[PDB]
Amino acid sequence: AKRKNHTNHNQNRKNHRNGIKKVKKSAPSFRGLNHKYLRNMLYSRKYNNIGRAAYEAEHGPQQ
Amino acid sequence: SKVIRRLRLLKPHHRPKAMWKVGETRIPVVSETMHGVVSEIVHERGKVA
Amino acid sequence: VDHPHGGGNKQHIGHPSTISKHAPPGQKVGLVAARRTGLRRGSKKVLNK
Amino acid sequence: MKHNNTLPNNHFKKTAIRFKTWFNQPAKKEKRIQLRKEKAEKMYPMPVEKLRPIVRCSSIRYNIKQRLGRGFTPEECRAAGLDYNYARTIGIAVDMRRKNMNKETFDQNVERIKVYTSRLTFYKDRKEAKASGAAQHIGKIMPPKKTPPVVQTIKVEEIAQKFP
Amino acid sequence: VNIPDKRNTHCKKCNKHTEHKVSQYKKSKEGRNGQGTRRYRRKQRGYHGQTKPILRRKAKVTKKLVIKLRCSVCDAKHQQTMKRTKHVEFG
RNA sequence: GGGGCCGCGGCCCCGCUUCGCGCAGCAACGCCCCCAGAUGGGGAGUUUGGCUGGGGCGGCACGUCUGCUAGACCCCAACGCAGACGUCCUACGGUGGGCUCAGCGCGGACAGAACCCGCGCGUCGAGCACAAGGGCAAACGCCCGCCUCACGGCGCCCCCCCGGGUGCCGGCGGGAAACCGGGGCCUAGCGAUCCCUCGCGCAUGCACGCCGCGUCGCGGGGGUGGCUGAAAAGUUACCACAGGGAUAACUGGCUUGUGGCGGCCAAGCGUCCGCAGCGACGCCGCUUUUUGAUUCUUCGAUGUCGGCUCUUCCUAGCAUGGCGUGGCAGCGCGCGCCAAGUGUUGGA
RNA sequence: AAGGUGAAUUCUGCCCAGUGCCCGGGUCACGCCGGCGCGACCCGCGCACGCACGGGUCAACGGCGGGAGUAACUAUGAC
RNA sequence: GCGGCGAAAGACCAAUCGAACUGCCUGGUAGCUGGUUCCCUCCGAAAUGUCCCGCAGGACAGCGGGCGCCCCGCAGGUCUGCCGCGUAGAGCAAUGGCGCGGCGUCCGGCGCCGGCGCACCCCCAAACUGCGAAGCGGCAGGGCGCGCGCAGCAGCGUGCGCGCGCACAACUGCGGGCGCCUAGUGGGCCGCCGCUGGUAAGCAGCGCCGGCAAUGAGGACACAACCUCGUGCGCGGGCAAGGGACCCCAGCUGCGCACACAGACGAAGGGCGCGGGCGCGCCCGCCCCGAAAAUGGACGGUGCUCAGCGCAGCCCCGACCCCGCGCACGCACAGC
RNA sequence: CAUGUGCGCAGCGAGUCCGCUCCGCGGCGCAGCGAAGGCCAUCGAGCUGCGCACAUGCGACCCGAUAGGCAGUGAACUACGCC
Numbered sequence A: 001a002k003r004k005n006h007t008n009h010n011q012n013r014k015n016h017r018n019g020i021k022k023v024k025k026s027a028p029s030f031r032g033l034n035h036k037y038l039r040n041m042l043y044s045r046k047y048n049n050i051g052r053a054a055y056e057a058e059h060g061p062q063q
Numbered sequence B: 001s002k003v004i005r006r007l008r009l010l011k012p013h014h015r016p017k018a019m020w021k022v023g024e025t026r027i028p029v030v031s032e033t034m035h036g037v038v039s040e041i042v043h044e045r046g047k048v049a
Numbered sequence C: 001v002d003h004p005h006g007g008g009n010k011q012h013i014g015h016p017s018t019i020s021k022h023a024p025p026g027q028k029v030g031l032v033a034a035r036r037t038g039l040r041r042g043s044k045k046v047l048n049k
Numbered sequence D: 001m002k003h004n005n006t007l008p009n010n011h012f013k014k015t016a017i018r019f020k021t022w023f024n025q026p027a028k029k030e031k032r033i034q035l036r037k038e039k040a041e042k043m044y045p046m047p048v049e050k051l052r053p054i055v056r057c058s059s060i061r062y063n064i065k066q067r068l069g070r071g072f073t074p075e076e077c078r079a080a081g082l083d084y085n086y087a088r089t090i091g092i093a094v095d096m097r098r099k100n101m102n103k104e105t106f107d108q109n110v111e112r113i114k115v116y117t118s119r120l121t122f123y124k125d126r127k128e129a130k131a132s133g134a135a136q137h138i139g140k141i142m143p144p145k146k147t148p149p150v151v152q153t154i155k156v157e158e159i160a161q162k163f164p
Numbered sequence E: 001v002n003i004p005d006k007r008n009t010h011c012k013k014c015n016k017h018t019e020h021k022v023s024q025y026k027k028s029k030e031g032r033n034g035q036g037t038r039r040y041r042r043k044q045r046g047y048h049g050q051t052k053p054i055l056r057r058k059a060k061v062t063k064k065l066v067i068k069l070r071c072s073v074c075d076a077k078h079q080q081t082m083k084r085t086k087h088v089e090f091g
Numbered sequence F: 001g002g003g004g005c006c007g008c009g010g011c012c013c014c015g016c017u018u019c020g021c022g023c024a025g026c027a028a029c030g031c032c033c034c035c036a037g038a039u040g041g042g043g044a045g046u047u048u049g050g051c052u053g054g055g056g057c058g059g060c061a062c063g064u065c066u067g068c069u070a071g072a073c074c075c076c077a078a079c080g081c082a083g084a085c086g087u088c089c090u091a092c093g094g095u096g097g098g099c100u101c102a103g104c105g106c107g108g109a110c111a112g113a114a115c116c117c118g119c120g121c122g123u124c125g126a127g128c129a130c131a132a133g134g135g136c137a138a139a140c141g142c143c144c145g146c147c148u149c150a151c152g153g154c155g156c157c158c159c160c161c162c163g164g165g166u167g168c169c170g171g172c173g174g175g176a177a178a179c180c181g182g183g184g185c186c187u188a189g190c191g192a193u194c195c196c197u198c199g200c201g202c203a204u205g206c207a208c209g210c211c212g213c214g215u216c217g218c219g220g221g222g223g224u225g226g227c228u229g230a231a232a233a234g235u236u237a238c239c240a241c242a243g244g245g246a247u248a249a250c251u252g253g254c255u256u257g258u259g260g261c262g263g264c265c266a267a268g269c270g271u272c273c274g275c276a277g278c279g280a281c282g283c284c285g286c287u288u289u290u291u292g293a294u295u296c297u298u299c300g301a302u303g304u305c306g307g308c309u310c311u312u313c314c315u316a317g318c319a320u321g322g323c324g325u326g327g328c329a330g331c332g333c334g335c336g337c338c339a340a341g342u343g344u345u346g347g348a
Numbered sequence G: 001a002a003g004g005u006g007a008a009u010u011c012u013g014c015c016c017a018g019u020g021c022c023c024g025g026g027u028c029a030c031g032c033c034g035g036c037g038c039g040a041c042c043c044g045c046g047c048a049c050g051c052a053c054g055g056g057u058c059a060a061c062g063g064c065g066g067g068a069g070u071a072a073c074u075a076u077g078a079c
Numbered sequence H: 001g002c003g004g005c006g007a008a009a010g011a012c013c014a015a016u017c018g019a020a021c022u023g024c025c026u027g028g029u030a031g032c033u034g035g036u037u038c039c040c041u042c043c044g045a046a047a048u049g050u051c052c053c054g055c056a057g058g059a060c061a062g063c064g065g066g067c068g069c070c071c072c073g074c075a076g077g078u079c080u081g082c083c084g085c086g087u088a089g090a091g092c093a094a095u096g097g098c099g100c101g102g103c104g105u106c107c108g109g110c111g112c113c114g115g116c117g118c119a120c121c122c123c124c125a126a127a128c129u130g131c132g133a134a135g136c137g138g139c140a141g142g143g144c145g146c147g148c149g150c151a152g153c154a155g156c157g158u159g160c161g162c163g164c165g166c167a168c169a170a171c172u173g174c175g176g177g178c179g180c181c182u183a184g185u186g187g188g189c190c191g192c193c194g195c196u197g198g199u200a201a202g203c204a205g206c207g208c209c210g211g212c213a214a215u216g217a218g219g220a221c222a223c224a225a226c227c228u229c230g231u232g233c234g235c236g237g238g239c240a241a242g243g244g245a246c247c248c249c250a251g252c253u254g255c256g257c258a259c260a261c262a263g264a265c266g267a268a269g270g271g272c273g274c275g276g277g278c279g280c281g282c283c284c285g286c287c288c289c290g291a292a293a294a295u296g297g298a299c300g301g302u303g304c305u306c307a308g309c310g311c312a313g314c315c316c317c318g319a320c321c322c323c324g325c326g327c328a329c330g331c332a333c334a335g336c
Numbered sequence I: 001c002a003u004g005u006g007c008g009c010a011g012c013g014a015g016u017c018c019g020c021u022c023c024g025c026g027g028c029g030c031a032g033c034g035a036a037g038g039c040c041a042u043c044g045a046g047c048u049g050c051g052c053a054c055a056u057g058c059g060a061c062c063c064g065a066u067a068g069g070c071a072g073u074g075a076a077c078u079a080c081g082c083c
């Protein structure tokens, strides 16, 4: 039978009972980053305290 | 639906009774010529002839 | 429930009463292998062919 | 159904499903012990078990271990020196469909018959047998002993010699 | 729509930009011995009726155009999905 | 229809009898049996959606898109308003360059309202497939050249999808280049599992090989418009059941469009004369005696029309009582007032 | 045996397009056959009832239309 | 018995017939109706979103409860700052309407009339906007400074590692964050303000907030929602809303006004009715006419003409509210 | 009752589980990924029982259809036919 279609009544009151929780803090993610930038940042992290020329002097051609 | 009366009369309990029949009316199978006398002309139930 | 002709609100057949000779028994009702219908109005020669 | 759960695989849709309860389980055990005792008393000197061969288990999961087989092949009984029909009259089981596959299973079972027949004392008849006073063997005749595998050791200078 | 017969595009097998001959992809008839053709055939035999649905409320008057691309170098075959159309000519 | 149903002869045809059969006959056919078509409401099952100011009929805020409703973030309902989509396009796509459109003005043989050309102006009033909105002037429009980024492989975002955005590595096109391009100026133009089909696979036949005889993975496609996706015609007044006052058919209630009744104004009519009496065009009310509207009460039932019978009540007064007024001489008639006591019939 | 109409009297008109029934002469299933194969297969062909096509039949189911002008007033419309 | 039998009514077939009766399958299934059994204590909803042959039902999400874990600062708020909106208003300036005049080296017709043009102007707009509020929304108010390494990115930066140094950032309040399992709910209704459809409706459909549902008690004559205001069991105080002639707790002092069985439902239109005010006409109060329904009857009643309509002063009454105390129960327990 | 999941409790713990039996190298876990060929960790506490809540299958909280089926019984009422 024909009845009520829609309301937003009591929705703000419901949504504030457990509050509007924030975005939950996380570790920083590489999701959404530029791929050329992210590839280069990991290369800088891979050869952080030892340079690349010294790293490939040890481990050979690293690619 | 139910069985129509046409199929329902085909069942053998709806046939005419055998006791109404005076007898089977067959031409006799004879080797030689048989001479008979018409003894009686009778009526059979149902049969106009 | 009684008949293929068994109808409603007016006494009429409602479908062609000329039935096929290959019909199911229970459908074979009315004119069962009718070559023609209606009043004859003719010799045997004109109607048979 | 409502929540997050493993999808139900409960097969009780048939109303013809029976249930086998186990209320006879302690009672069947005491009946089973009583019949085993009465079998041992019916065959007083003779062991209650047949002598059964040592066979290797079939698949690749189980061929590391051996179990106790069904019967000895007639070619095993002949190499042990026995007719297989005579071998059944003493307590040896005979298997006509097992195939003599290799020398290691063959020679182990031939030795297994020879050890068994060496360990037998015969009696003249049943009355001589029951009055023998000989203690009869209960349990499986010469079962394969389950052991943890011993770790073999070689010297480290010998490693390149054995496995180059 | 009108599509060219020839089209220089990327060939996956060449890893080059080569000319491809262009034709329309049409679905083949269903083979006799696919596993679903077989399973439907064994289900239909006997007194089982129609064991599978037959769609009777169709709505679409078009199918999506698929182009077959055939490499002039490789003789490689690959396909491209284009839009729904009622009519297509080549050349 | 074909096959099986073990027979002889002769030319599919004709004899035959010894099979078979409903058996003095037919006849090696057919009965019968086995497959396979055709027919088949005679019968068997089953189906015949939803939304809905009851249901039905109708129509689809049943999937998608634009403007409004919408009350200045966003979101926001109605069988709300105004519409649209299901296609179309090898160009109407990509890009580079050049250009400027609609319209107006003033000139020019035939030449006219309307042929073409020129000059001047021209903020976008044009065009951009289409609905609408947004956008756009050395352009997002027009014209021309060269093209096919309407591409493969990996991601990510907006995010049910649909669609779009954004990256990376390749492959390219245009351009001197910067740049631009991952189809259509942007916002619609589309579709699960299973199945089929095609392309691709550095897959595969679980004792081992081979035979596309198959099976898989990945990506397309074939489709569910009732658009998160059954495979589906009716009738029942012979109907049954579970229910529903979530919901119609009486009364009641709210409302009063319609019905009924009453006022206000006074154009005009009434011999002259707006108002003796009327009274248009308009406007304001009242009533619940009409009919709707709605669906609040009732569907484990409130007996549904009319009449008969019998009682009572209201006044918006028909008669009877008293009056006022008249375009009231009388007789009569009209208009108005007070009053609900008593009355208000017999019939076709 | 199957139907319809329902005594008599007087009658029972027109329609075979549709549907049905009946009659007559391209398409189609299995097997067969043929191609192919090492085999499974796969590929083809032939065809009966039917459909189709042609015909009959309404005391079979049933059906049985419009628009314009037009006479000695007008009206009507024989035409 | 999906059978019979029927001069046909779906009639009849053992008080049963549009498919009899018996036993069984069978405790058939039911998104539907009904019912669902002790007490106290602690907390306490939803009637919404998406999808569904979905619309009397579900599942997911939201909300409730219970169980946890973790020390990360937390907020239905204000302030300060920067962006966003396009409603009310305003505007005819573009789009789209409306309407008359005015003007004219414009056109037509016979100086006039009609067209057209222009400028002013008029009435306008949910699907118009040169403007644009009130009101809202987003975000910020803490880490910074320096140095050194790294990169295949880049072409002269950007990120990322590491070290040293500096340092606690408007107001107010205050513990907070996260996880797990599970219920009920998914017919709502009402008020305020803002709306849509509709002649309207105790009608239908929305937005925001509050309520009822599930919220007692006081006041409303009674009365789910109004007003006050929350609510253990008592005692004492003070009050709220609302009242203070009698019902019925609580009133007196003064100043006005009104006479109509008024106050006690109402319109347009009226009234040398009364009281004030302004320039005979207006204006403001009260009253009157307009003002008619059916059981006898309702400011709640009695009644009231200072119990009506207004005001002022002081006072009073009145809830489980607030305050204080005591007790019970709960808590992480000098308390709440 | 079966099977799960979550929580609590309990024993042992890279293990764990007596109860089929006269004696589990049976299950799960100590590590996963892929359809597969193939790849294999940079890596992780589980097993079993007890109890409750909840999900599902079962008669499934209790009671309830109209129906459908299978097997039977009736023409002493009544319908028709025959003797």
Ligand SMILES: [Mg+2]
Residues within 6 Å of the ligand: B001, C003, C004
């Ligand atoms: Mg019938």
Ligand SMILES: [Mg+2]
Residues within 6 Å of the ligand: C004, C005, C006, C007, C008, C011, C012, C013, C014
């Ligand atoms: Mg009929």
Ligand SMILES: [Mg+2]
Residues within 6 Å of the ligand: C011
């Ligand atoms: Mg008749």
Ligand SMILES: [Mg+2]
Residues within 6 Å of the ligand: C015
């Ligand atoms: Mg028929």
Ligand SMILES: [Mg+2]
Residues within 6 Å of the ligand: E045, E046
């Ligand atoms: Mg078959």
Ligand SMILES: [Mg+2]
Residues within 6 Å of the ligand: F040, F041
């Ligand atoms: Mg049929």
Ligand SMILES: [Mg+2]
Residues within 6 Å of the ligand: F041
């Ligand atoms: Mg049927």
Ligand SMILES: [Mg+2]
Residues within 6 Å of the ligand: none
């Ligand atoms: Mg419906």
Ligand SMILES: [Mg+2]
Residues within 6 Å of the ligand: F070
């Ligand atoms: Mg808005």
Ligand SMILES: [Mg+2]
Residues within 6 Å of the ligand: F092, F184
């Ligand atoms: Mg375009």
Ligand SMILES: [Mg+2]
Residues within 6 Å of the ligand: none
């Ligand atoms: Mg374009």
Ligand SMILES: [Mg+2]
Residues within 6 Å of the ligand: none
């Ligand atoms: Mg334009």
Ligand SMILES: [Mg+2]
Residues within 6 Å of the ligand: none
């Ligand atoms: Mg698009």
Ligand SMILES: [Mg+2]
Residues within 6 Å of the ligand: F182
């Ligand atoms: Mg794109």
Ligand SMILES: [Mg+2]
Residues within 6 Å of the ligand: F226
């Ligand atoms: Mg649907």
Ligand SMILES: [Mg+2]
Residues within 6 Å of the ligand: none
């Ligand atoms: Mg849907």
